[PDB]
Design a protein around this ligand. Structure first.
Ligand code: 1W0
Length: 373
């Protein structure tokens, strides 16, 4: 898997992208790696924030599906025209796929200024594809058309201009050089999003003591296309209360806790130790078991932007369930084992750790929590 190592790049807070080619001759595009959606969609017309876009008429292998697609999100939306074309990942498997492509012709608040990506690779399941589940997602096509095993893994690494980030998307396998210690698996509850179950949450060793249905109200997902850890209202408020208490030695503005305002310290003086660790316990493959992933402030305080180190609080409130976003995934090696309907976590080769604490994956812990039906 050596050629796939460090095949991801991005700007802090703006997603991780992989280089892809579309069409014949190949058109090079940077594509957001998104485990939270299921469409492959690319800019296909000029936009103020696009360096370049997919030009269908320049591809000898383009086929029009003669069907429109409209995709609204909570914030932002796009519309496009469906077709198929040949797609490759130059620093991926040595294969070429005929994939569905939504050619984006109009959009609002979708593309991001400076993100350096021109489209989105939805790696989740057909159930949440638009216009409906008959539009085969990219990974499904990849597996069907080639002999690539039905599994991929993500090693997202943490970090004027926004800090550059890097990582690896290993398609078709597990690269043992990218993690240390044991890989722990949590079941994929249903194949739509990458839905999982959280059974317990601790802040600095202290149980939040909530009925575990609260942690998965109305779902919990693993989402590389969301920056933050997003928590349901009740869980969010309890989490913030606890983090405040642990770091009470210092006082921060309200807008900070709201994930809006920055907090800055003299370069290199960031008081990491006043911020507590967060442990999320994920359901194990065995019914009464769980394992925990422990995240550090170095993950949930996200760097932004001279001689000041500034951060945003990368935990925020959700009304659509828990989202384990990029700041959670960072420093873990995360295996999306579609074949065995499970997601693996291990401590990443690029995990964060200071003198006293480290990101960890530990189990088992032994003791219903699923919410949506
Ligand atoms: N997962 C996900 N993908 C979505 C999305 C769309 C556009 C940009 C980004 C993004 C921005 N900034 C950092 N990362 C990603 C994420 C679309 C599907 O659901 C809503 C969003 O959440």
């Amino acid at each position: 898997f050596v050629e796939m190592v460090d095949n991801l790049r991005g700007k802090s807070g703006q997603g991780y992208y992989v280089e892809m080619t579309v069409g014949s001759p190949p058109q090079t595009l940077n594509i957001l790696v998104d485990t939270g959606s299921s469409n492959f969609a690319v800019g296909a017309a000029p936009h103020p924030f696009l360096h370049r876009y997919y030009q269908r008429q320049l591809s000898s292998t383009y086929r029009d599906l003669r069907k429109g697609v409209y995709v609204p999100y909570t914030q932002g939306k796009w519309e496009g025209e469906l077709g198929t074309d040949l797609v490759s990942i130059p620093h991926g498997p040595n294969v070429t796929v005929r994939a569905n492509i939504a050619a984006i012709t109009e959009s609002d608040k979708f593309f991001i200024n400076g993100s350096n990506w021109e489209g989105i690779l939805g790696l989740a399941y057909a159930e949440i594809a638009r216009p409906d589940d008959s539009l085969e997602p990219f990974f499904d096509s990849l597996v069907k058309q080639t002999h690539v095993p039905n599994l991929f893994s993500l090693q997202l690494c943490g970090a004027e201009v926004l800090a550059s980030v890097g990582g690896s998307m290993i398609i078709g396998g597990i690269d043992h050089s990218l993690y240390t210690g044991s890989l722990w698996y949590t079941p994929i509850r249903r194949e739509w999003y990458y839905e999982v179950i959280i059974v317990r949450v601790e802040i600095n060793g202290q149980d939040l003591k909530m009925d575990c249905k609260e942690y998965n109200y109305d779902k919990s997902i693993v989402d590389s296309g969301t920056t933050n850890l997003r928590l349901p209202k009740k869980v969010f408020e309890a989490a913030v209360k606890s983090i405040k208490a642990a770091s009470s030695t210092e006082k921060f503005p309200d807008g900070f806790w709201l994930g809006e305002q920055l907090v800055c310290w003299q370069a290199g003086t960031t008081p990491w130790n006043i911020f507590p660790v967060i442990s999320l316990y994920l359901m194990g493959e065995v019914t009464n078991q769980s394992f925990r992933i422990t995240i550090l402030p170095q993950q949930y305080l996200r760097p932004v932007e001279s001689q000041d180190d500034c951060y945003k609080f990368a935990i925020s409130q959700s009304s659509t369930g828990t989202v384990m976003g990029a700041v959670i995934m960072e420093g873990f090696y995360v295996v999306f084992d579609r074949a065995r309907k499970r997601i693996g976590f291990a401590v990443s080769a690029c995990h964060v750790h200071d003198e006293f604490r480290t990101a960890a994956v530990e189990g088992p812990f032994v003791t219903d929590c699923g919410y949506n039906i």
